[model samples]
Target: VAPLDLVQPISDYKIYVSENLQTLVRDTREFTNAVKAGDVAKAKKLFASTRMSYERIEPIAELFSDLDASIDSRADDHEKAEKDPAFFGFHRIEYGLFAQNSAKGLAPVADKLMADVLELQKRIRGLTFPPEKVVGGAAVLMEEVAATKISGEEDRYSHTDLWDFQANFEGAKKIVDLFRPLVVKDNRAFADKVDANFDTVFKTLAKYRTADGGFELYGKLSERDRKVLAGRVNTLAEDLSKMRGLLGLDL
Candidate 1:
């Protein structure tokens, strides 16, 4: 059975996803238009400003600044892609344009970002957390600690944290999977780079699975175990950094 914490009311997550997507579309238009105007400085400033708009709901938008920097890194001052406005950034602009076309321009490229956001939301809505019984059962094993109620001592841990961690990990996994198809369809070369990075990350995270078929966040595990997990986390970070590199993202 699914974990209870994972069982979010589909509606709540879907709403957030939809809200995020709308924000993506709104911001993309401003950035895209700025780029098209042959004003690199304007585009850069606009993109920066647009990114700040989504900072609260989805901080990932800030990563695009790095992508912009990378693209600029390869271009001569006057030939910069941002200066062309028409020259789509290989990483994200192509997909945005395609989405715009797909909607027959009835919806702008920004709308397409919204579509992607909604798609992600739909997927999130489908997930189920661990059953309540599992968490409740785990709680039973900790009743003694609860009863103690010593100063600065609490439940020490929560059964919900396990389900929350798993849910978050799985949700991110699904979102990345959804992002891959769209990206590949938009730019195969960039997609390939992203795929390599993703695979490395997956392998690293897979190494941390505990013997009991669960992931342990913090526990009295052996020093060697901790080292291994730490290494895995570092590898994952590196893989993500590379992915951002491909997209000209910052973090």
Candidate 2:
């Protein structure tokens, strides 16, 4: 058996991914204006938030390997590549703005990021994806959360990693929720397991809420608090990893 085909589910995911990429493109434009105008505060703030949408659909983005490398690649990736040219992208801007505590010298990097985001926006808008992408994407996003999202590495300088975490979770959950109906038609009991695990994951995220409804900075979290959050994320990843098999998505 090829498992239940997920035609409608795949259509929904393509639209959802396109929507998020467009949002990312919009933010990248605003971020460009801020950087160009030398508004250090605004540029720095938008840097982290702008990356959220990209992180959410990273599984699909990964398909554009060269663009992903150009736009979202991390500092370590550059270091490992041992390449010069300074690795211009979102993180490069982050480093200049936060690491140096000044927005000077970031305009060029912002321009490059803007170009990349615009290209990505145009490319992803009309994409058609397979249903198994959702199954695979859900697993990949969860594992990312467990590994680096919880560790605050994504936005190391700005400490806004939680925003990325939330967006990524939203994206991952969308896949699972949309796929739930198909899974139910095939096997309702397994769908229940998926739903329960998602609930548990979200309940843990609720603990990070601040007085103003913003998330607490990753740095401000206590040692024990970090562990608890990471534990929940890891547990969720464990459950999500099984989704491929349970949903009969593996060929």
Candidate 3:
């Protein structure tokens, strides 16, 4: 059975997704335009910003596994690794632009990514946002950061994992913020704990910000720094996972 009683909160979350999805579509168009124009510098400048929207709405976007796999799947996710013919997406473009130091051969990949994002936007229009997934998404975002993103594997080429990190954090926080009233009403202590955890994570992330408001490259972080981040996120994830149960949306 569905959590049909969450009508208002779900409606608000849908609007949030719709807004982020539109930004994703717009940003991808401009990013792909730069790629196809062979403006490598411009494309590189736009990369993280474009991906911000994508990462911010990842949980919703991830509902379409085909689009997620095609647009964001990494090299190791494939059968033949990077050599696989199907290996194409944001990371593939990242390889060409950052690793290879050129966007000469990435026009097709950029075009396809734009198409995939549009398809995601289209599909979401007809889709209902699952309450369980929406509530559970908070934990999943932190889990990704704690489990893999801290390792710097996500954006190995550009070393921009920090941007993805921030985006994911914002996405999860958005969910909690939207449902804050409910969570607090259900269990004020739990809500306060979650809020404190978020504050801790935010303060940790703030240290990595650059003068231009971008993040330090993931490569620059020492082992100890990553461990600190992982620990904080894991703690948050532990608390966030209970959000579903708190909301009585858990299966």
Candidate 4:
């Protein structure tokens, strides 16, 4: 059991959610505006960074399941793949920008994406943060990176999975940092091991950074690079999965 009260951790987590949602709303607006304006270059430049705001708070955002699907769902989530009409949102726009190489017909899609995220921003404020979800979010984010983002499937069109990977890593770390005191109290060794795993992931990912501060295309990653990062991320995920149990927050 946690040696400390959860009230403070929960409060801080809520604050983090509130702040990230605001940033998501703000960045989404700018991104969609670029699409609407048919400025493909600007939209591409903003794409991955804007998504980091949402990715950082994804587990909370995902609580609104409908909005999550509408705003962030990928091509595979739909019945007909990219051809499915339901396949629209960030990935849809990514397909247009990177795969199709134009923002010509994406204005409406961009508008809807903007609307959905705005609704998410408003709705997230009304719910109290679930302690289980907050703590378990670390595991979920890391698992996501290891399972899909690392495969280069997440941002396939843009080859931008590296950006998503980093965002998930940061989000997981954010959760751990929020609950650090309790986690350390529960088991100091476990906490340090988690940090060390994250450090290794950070150093590995740093190799892919471009001159402009973004990552190189995911397709550029070699098999060895993928294997190394996957190993580190899997370790982090396994450690994080213990947080809820460690803190007695399981439910």
Candidate 5:
């Protein structure tokens, strides 16, 4: 694996999650302001960057499952979707800005979004991250990417699903790197496999990103490219899953 420190991953995730929540609050507030001002274009741009912090740290975000659902749920997850009273979060705002391609009726949704993320920060403020938990989180994140993100459905409106996918991968990678020694201690060969697997997936995802540092719109990618991404992520998720038993995490 990486020749990185392993003694502090628990403390590191606690700190990282805290700082990311702060960034989320700041970015989400700006997004709300732009939407309130009827600036759909600016709000749409802010959505990608602001949501990056949350997506990167989403394993932790999933701890607040209710809030996570309210914030990131796809329209299909709900009964009425955009018309549903419960659909007030990032995807809701995205639907307004991109699918509708207009800023109309966005202020209230943005307002609710601002409050939800501030709440998200409050919930994340005092978490404890044991080493096993962090490793398990990495595996869990890979599962979500394998299942939900790689299909180009997460950001269906803006076609920026790859950005979320890559950030989540980085988040999982960061935690695993921090705990590499512990993992190796548990099972050297499997730990090493996870390390190499993550590297390969990272490089694969990078191939589709633009020079401007943005992932090309998911809709712009060909079927072959999408399948390529899905296959790699599925393989990595399988690699990551083995860590749970190796690390003494419950099945």
Candidate 6:
């Protein structure tokens, strides 16, 4: 098992989520402008750089995959499962319940943000670029393309997982959108071009978003639902912190 020290506090988690989302938005906006203005080289560099940022947070998101699988494996008629304290307990402590609830509270904002990302990607993909020639014009490279992949079982949880995945997806999509225009203009411009196929990478990374919003250490729950459970989770957090303090961790 991973050490508890590796698990960040609810406040830290919230900060990371918000910061990451903002990063995605900012980068995508710049990329979109580059594409629209025909700044091919600038677009390519931004695209390559954005992927590095994506790599930083992807593993953190993937940590929730097992939680998604667990929730999916439950019996189909398990409506009562939702009412079980254990069901909620699994997620509350593991993924920082307070943070998940906080994320849910911001879903509407997140959704709008994602929608903008999608439109930006679509526009980037539709940009026109001159074809490239190879081997006496025998072969040619067409316009640049960007894509994404989603992974994990279908039987898992619902809204929370979707939201988390959506956030990550939108982030990656932005990166690809930012870079594809550059690749078309100059394939050799960036060393990371070989790793530019983010669709497959994103699929692997998406597993962290379980059926619910929580990580693998716990079951999933929507951000909003998580918020509603704050009172209960706060008490639990205090107890856990006290226990850790006794262990000399000074949590």
Best candidate, lDDT: 3
Model 3 reaches what TM-score against the true structure?
Answer: 0.95
lDDT of 3: 0.86
Error of 2 at 215 (Å): 1.5
Q: Residue 161: error of model 3 in Å?
A: 0.4
Tell me the TM-score of model 5. Answer: 0.89
- What is candidate 4's TM-score against the reference? 0.93
What are the per-residue Cα lDDT tens digits for candidate 1 across 1-251?
12232334223434554565466457666665554544444443344334332322222321244433322121122265324433322223322232222212222333444444444335434544222222222222222112322111211222112222232233333333433443455566765664554465445445556798554443433556434444443443443444333333332
Which candidate do you rate higher for TM-score, 2 or 3?
3
Q: Write the per-residue lDDT of candidate 3 for residues 1-251, one digit (tens) a residue.
A: 22555777889988888998999999999999999999999999999999998898888888889899999999899898766779888999998899888997788999899999999999988898878888777788788889877889889799999899888988888888877777666588888888899899989989999998879998888999999999999987888788888778765
Task: Write model 5 residue lDDT over 78-136, tens digit each, in one string.
Answer: 89977887787899889989989787887888888888898888877766665666677
Worst 10 residues of 1 by lDDT: 150-159
Overall lDDT per candidate, in order of appearance: 0.37, 0.76, 0.86, 0.84, 0.78, 0.33
- Evaluation by TM-score, superior candidate among 3 and 5: 3
Clashes of 1: 17
In candidate 4, which residue ranges exceed 4 Å CA deviation? Answer: 1-4
Candidate 6 yields a Cα-based lDDT of: 0.33
Name the regions of candidate 6 deviating beyond 4 angstroms: 1-8, 59-251
Q: Rank order by lDDT, top first?
A: 3, 4, 5, 2, 1, 6
Stretches > 4 Å off in candidate 5: 1-7, 184-190
Q: Between candidates 1 and 3, name the one with more favorable lDDT.
A: 3
TM-score, ranked from best to worst: 3, 4, 5, 2, 1, 6
Which digits, one per residue and each the tens of the lDDT, describe model 6 over residues 51-141?
3333333433233444322321222224654343333211221122222222222223223333544443343234322111111011100
Error of 4 at 241 (Å): 1.8
Q: Give the lowest summed-lDDT range of ten residues in model 3.
A: 1-10
Q: Highest TM-score, which number?
A: 3
Model 4 C-alpha lDDT per residue in residues 6-122, reported as the tens digit of each score: 888788878887898888888888899999999999999999989998888888878888899999888999899988989889999999999998997899999899899889888
